[PDB]
């Protein structure tokens, strides 16, 4: 069997930038490689076909290059919709094997986080339950910490962090926090405090609630 | 325009099997081959095999020949896999594709397959109110399978929408929605998430009110 | 060392996805394992042969032989004497 090697497993560009996503074969492979696009949460759109030759309705900016073993996807002038995953694949013989995979990140100009805190709703509260959510929105690099405090001091278990895929027009992350904890345990504290840390300041943004 | 049709999503029991479509048209059906891929998350993409409606010619990679039984039916231009004795590495997105010496070109959307002898369970809805734009959204907790599909005053309120991805407690998926409204919009107009469960056949609104 | 018995047709000739030829074929002779004897001749034709020098393994084996015939009319003979397997092949 043969062998794709995409050893590029991360990539960040920033826009109008040139990349060149290299794929390794195993064996003597000729040009039956092709390059596939997979924006997240999407179906795979075929970019390159025989090693060289672009697709209809593929832009310019994207070139296949290479016979044998050593194959290359390059994208000159790197738009922010070019966020996705790319990979080779081997049609030489059966069975036909795919390339690792190359997340491709698109850099841009650091965006501070929106943060927004929400306490649980009565609906919850009469279930026995209290969740306690916080939204840290539009921010640049995908590196963020989110901390929680309940009366001052610090809250770790119970809390569910979930990023969302890099935004295919303005380029930024965005992030939830769920602190999950009883009713009880809710009704027995006042003061509940959600603090973001990211390097757009110096000093934590802190959005807090009480009780009262 | 081609167009490869695949059920979003299957939900299977452990040691049971799956019968998935792949719905071809826009094109000849019986002069390309048809392919089918698997997905595992976070993880590449593998080459299960391949059929010829024009012949009914098959190959498959050895990795899944006890697994996949790739059949055609011409008459419905539709492409089938069926999947076998279940395990959770069966847990995957399933993917067909049209074929050529140019290989796969036209790939169609993939059914997410999940093994487990989980009941189906519907989610519980909560509305996120706070206490120059104002922040809204909405909680979708404790339902099984996935997926489930937030829409924001009937699909006009996007493009400040931030859809989270599911996360497990307990067995059970939870996850969240955010919408970005300017301040004066909200409470003046009338903000609802209309939060879909197909597994589960609901549809739970949930009006967004102040304090 | 060359296979000197009757290989039989386990699947017949078809043509791949990727525009080459597979046979299955069945060996039901001794001398296992063994290369098999593969000629492509045309109306002999030389390095159409994609799989990687078949054998038959042990006798009652089956073995997948891919080839890229010439286009048009070709003969692919499979073993050796007269138990020697002529195919007939159309490639468009």
Known sequence: DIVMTQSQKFMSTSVGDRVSITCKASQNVRTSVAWYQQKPGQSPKALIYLASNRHTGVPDRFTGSGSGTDFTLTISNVQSEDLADYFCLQHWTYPYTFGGGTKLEIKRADAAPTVSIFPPSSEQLTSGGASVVCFLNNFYPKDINVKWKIDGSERQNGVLNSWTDQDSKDSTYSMSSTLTLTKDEYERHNSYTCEATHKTSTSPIVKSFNRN | ?211 | TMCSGKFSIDKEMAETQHGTTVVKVKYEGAGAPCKVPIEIRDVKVVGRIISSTPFAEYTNSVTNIELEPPFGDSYIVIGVGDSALTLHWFRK
């Not at chain 2, 301040?183 to 549809?203: D, F, G, L, R």
Request: aromatic share 10%.
């Open chain 2, 1 to 211: 325009d081609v167009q490869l049709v695949e059920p979003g999503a299957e939900l299977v029991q452990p040691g049971a099997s799956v019968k998935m479509s792949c719905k071809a048209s826009g094109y000849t059906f019986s002069s390309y081959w048809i392919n089918w891929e698997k997905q595992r998350p976070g993880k590449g993409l593998e080459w299960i095999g391949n059929i010829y409606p024009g012949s009914g010619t098959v190959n498959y990679d050895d990795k899944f020949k006890s697994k996949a039984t790739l059949t055609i039916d011409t008459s419905s231009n539709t492409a089938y896999m069926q999947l076998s004795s279940l395990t959770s590495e069966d847990s995957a997105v399933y993917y067909c594709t049209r074929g050529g010496s140019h290989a796969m070109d036209y790939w169609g959307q993939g059914t997410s397959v999940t093994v487990s002898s989980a009941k189906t369970t519907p989610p519980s809805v909560y509305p996120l109110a706070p206490g120059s734009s104002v922040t809204l959204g909405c909680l979708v907790k404790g339902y099984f399978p996935e997926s489930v599909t937030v829409t924001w005053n009937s699909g006009s309120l996007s493009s400040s929408v931030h859809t989270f991805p599911a996360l497990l407690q307990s067995g059970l998926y939870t996850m969240s929605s955010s919408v970005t409204v300017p301040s004066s919009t909200w409470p003046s107009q009338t903000v609802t998430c209309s939060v879909a469960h197909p597994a589960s056949s609901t549809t739970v609104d949930k009006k967004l009110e102040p304090r």
